[PDB]
Amino acid sequence: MIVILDNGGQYVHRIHRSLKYIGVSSKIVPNTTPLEEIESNKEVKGIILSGGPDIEKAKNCIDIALNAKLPILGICLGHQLIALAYGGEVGRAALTKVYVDKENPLFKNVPREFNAWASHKDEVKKVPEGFEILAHSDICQVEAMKHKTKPIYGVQFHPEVAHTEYGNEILKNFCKVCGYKFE
Ligand SMILES: [Zn+2]
Ligand SMILES: [Zn+2]
Ligand SMILES: [Zn+2]
Ligand SMILES: [Zn+2]
Ligand SMILES: [Zn+2]
Ligand SMILES: [Zn+2]
């Protein structure tokens, strides 16, 4: 099972439907849910930090990003909250051409280029120390990132919206990082 923290986004339920599509169970919990409550259920293989409109209503994701033993994927706001947590810089900014520099876990079975959706207004300007950039666009330097040694992933785009090319494959890939096999 995957736990999804509700950061208020209008597409949070779409993450739960996308996971079910690829055969993965998920539960939408409040973003005030403590880590010790998520990590005590032995069937949780991973945490997703959802998108949302207000980063001030989602700062519990900070501690989760720093303390989780489980793998973490941040989407949009969740991606930003990961950057803030580890001391990276976040600043002011829909269909974007995304260039994959490191096929890493996240972009295996995805083309080197693809179109990704997000109307964000805030982006990651500098990746935290001990992170690396996996993907960028023409203008913006960080479209997706990972900690170099921890299973912590962020994507500025929403892979749970149809408008995003290969979005279910990117979610499937994070599930592979969470120890899911498929065949
Ligand atoms: Zn359901
Ligand atoms: Zn968003
Ligand atoms: Zn590049
Ligand atoms: Zn963008
Ligand atoms: Zn941007
Ligand atoms: Zn930019």
Side-chain angles (χ1 to χ4, degrees), residues 54-56 58-68 70-101 103-107 109-111 113-120 122-124 127-142:
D54 195 350
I55 202 180
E56 302 311 338
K59 297 275 181 93
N60 177 57
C61 295
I62 269 141
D63 280 314
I64 286 195
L66 293 166
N67 303 315
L70 296 178
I72 294 213
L73 177 60
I75 295 168
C76 200
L77 195 73
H79 162 66
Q80 298 154 203
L81 285 152
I82 299 179
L84 288 175
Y86 281 84
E89 289 165 10
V90 164
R92 304 264 180 174
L95 194 286
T96 296
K97 163 172 265 83
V98 174
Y99 306 93
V100 172
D101 287 353
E103 191 188 343
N104 73 131
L106 265 196
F107 301 113
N109 301 130
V110 179
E113 246 170 66
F114 63 95
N115 295 328
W117 181 269
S119 226
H120 41 114
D122 273 2
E123 62 185 60
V124 167
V127 89
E129 177 65 190
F131 288 58
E132 51 181 351
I133 300 179
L134 309 166
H136 59 84
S137 63
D138 277 58
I139 303 319
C140 298
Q141 281 174 54
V142 183

